[PDB]
């Protein structure tokens, strides 16, 4: 039903979520932005190197309890 997830960014602090396995991760991405006060389009969310799209769900991605999502900010060069 629900799954626990860790969202870990540059500050290495863990933001803990407990979301349904069927709902789109777009709303986790929105929540995390709000929490850290930056726009959603300024962050990249990866699960084991794969870019998390808005329509992805933990079940479709094969996530398991307390799996880690990594957040990165934009790079330019």
């Amino acid at each position: 039903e629900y799954i626990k997830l860790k969202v870990i960014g540059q500050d290495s602090s863990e933001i803990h979520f407990k979301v349904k396995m069927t709902t789109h991760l777009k709303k986790l991405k929105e929540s995390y932005c709000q929490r850290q006060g930056v726009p959603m389009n300024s962050l990249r969310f990866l699960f084991d190197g794969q870019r998390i799209a808005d329509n992805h769900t933990p079940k479709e991605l094969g996530m398991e309890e307390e799996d880690v999502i990594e957040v990165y900010q934009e790079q330019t060069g």
């Binding site: 990249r44 990866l46 084991d48 190197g49 870019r51 990594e70 990165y72 790079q75």
Partner: peptide
């Protein structure tokens, strides 16, 4: 193609940081 974040994560956390990227 490894994305642009692979090498940063390999440098700072080593193989254990990127082991699941090739699952």
């Amino acid at each position: 193609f490894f994305n642009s974040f692979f090498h940063r994560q390999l440098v700072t956390k080593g193989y254990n940081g990127v082991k699941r990227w090739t699952k």
